[PDB]
């Protein structure tokens, strides 16, 4: 009935920053701009949500407290706590329909919206569970996040496939023009399961990975995924639909293998991109014995040409690509040498780190 708690500033800041992650869109339901604060038994729970996903932080209450719930503006409450001095004791209490924040001789009275109006994701039971290092989840997402579509009619492409198979966790992202797939062993036998996480949920999952050694405990249900890292619980609804099969998109029999230094290739594509068409980003690749030539032309008839010494012994061929798709892959690989496997001018190209097969990229060419 009369929520109250006193908590040291640094036990509140990162939690407040974490639970504010899903907020920031266009104003819809007023309470979506607020954080839900709940004091129950010895815990302060803070929740932020955008209806599709939510982030919850549990903070242990060692100092006197009284139970109850309310919601307050997220940015203002975080800005008050952030603006207070290091070591400030932040005393919070509900006073009628106002939430009072006090520390030293600083006093803030915030407007509130009822906790009964706060959107809670519907009840669900997990069917799959596994625990993995945060570094493995970071690796999986960073290797493939850039290939997800942005607002494609096929809503299942505006997200990332998370697939468990044997002892591996795998991510797949594609927009139908380019595809990225990454697989990592996670040291435990898993059922074969596939879910599509919304792109915003993928970005939220990445943000919650502090880099430390608290493990990431994942729970997957029929329609939701939950990720537990320390005292933070991230939940998101899943995306419906049939995601494409990366096994059927990987080029069948590349008869042409190219190998070059990742950085020399990245810089050559980066420079050629400067004089490519700003909307269509088209570059031509001319592969010949131990040589890769990249050309770029734009509507001003400006032209970039880059010649590289590469390892290549297949047949001579020309193939056009969107340079942003090629650069996204090279930027994501950040290795010493890269391998490009081709078939012909109208077929996809597989690109990968020459020293590792954990991630694979498939880029479809342009008729150029």
């Amino acid at each position: 009935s009369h929520m109250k708690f006193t908590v040291e500033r640094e036990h509140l800041l990162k939690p407040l920053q974490q639970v504010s992650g899903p907020l920031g869109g266009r104003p819809t339901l007023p309470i979506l701009g607020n954080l839900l604060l709940q004091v129950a038994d010895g815990t302060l729970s803070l929740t932020g949500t955008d209806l599709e996903m939510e982030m919850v932080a549990r903070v242990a209450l060692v100092q006197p407290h009284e139970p109850g719930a309310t919601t307050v503006p997220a940015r203002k409450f975080f800005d008050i706590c952030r603006g207070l001095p290091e070591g400030a004791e932040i005393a919070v209490q509900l006073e009628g329909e106002r939430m009072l924040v006090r520390s030293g001789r600083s006093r803030f009275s915030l407007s509130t919206l009822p906790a009964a109006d706060f959107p809670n994701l519907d009840d669900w039971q997990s069917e799959v569970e596994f625990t993995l290092p945060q570094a493995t989840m970071k690796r999986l997402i960073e290797a493939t996040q850039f290939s997800m579509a942005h607002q494609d009619v096929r809503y299942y492409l505006n997200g990332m496939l998370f697939e468990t198979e044997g002892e591996e966790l795998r991510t797949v992202a594609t927009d139908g023009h380019r595809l990225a797939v990454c697989s990592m062993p996670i040291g435990q036998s898993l059922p074969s399961h596939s879910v599509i996480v919304p792109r915003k949920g993928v970005i939220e999952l990445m943000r919650m990975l502090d880099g430390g050694d608290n493990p990431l405990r994942v729970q997957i249900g029929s329609n939701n995924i939950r990720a537990h890292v320390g005292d933070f619980i991230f939940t998101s609804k899943l995306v419906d639909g049939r995601f494409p099969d990366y096994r059927r998109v990987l080029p069948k029999n590349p008869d042409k293998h190219l190998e070059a230094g990742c950085d020399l290739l990245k810089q050559a594509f980066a420079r050629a991109a400067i004089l490519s068409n700003e909307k269509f980003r088209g570059v031509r690749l001319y592969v010949s014995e131990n040589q890769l030539k990249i050309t770029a032309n734009n509507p001003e008839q400006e032209e970039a040409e880059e010649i590289l010494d590469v390892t290549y012994s297949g047949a001579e061929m020309e193939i056009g690509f969107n340079v942003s798709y090629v650069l996204d892959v090279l930027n994501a690989l950040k290795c010493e040498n890269v391998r490009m496997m081709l078939t012909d001018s109208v077929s996809s190209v597989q690109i990968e780190d020459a020293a590792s097969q954990s991630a694979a990229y498939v880029v479809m060419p342009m008729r150029l």
Partner: peptide, 6 residues
């Protein structure tokens, strides 16, 4: 034109 993976 950009080709599609499928």
């Amino acid at each position: 034109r950009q080709a599609x993976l499928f």
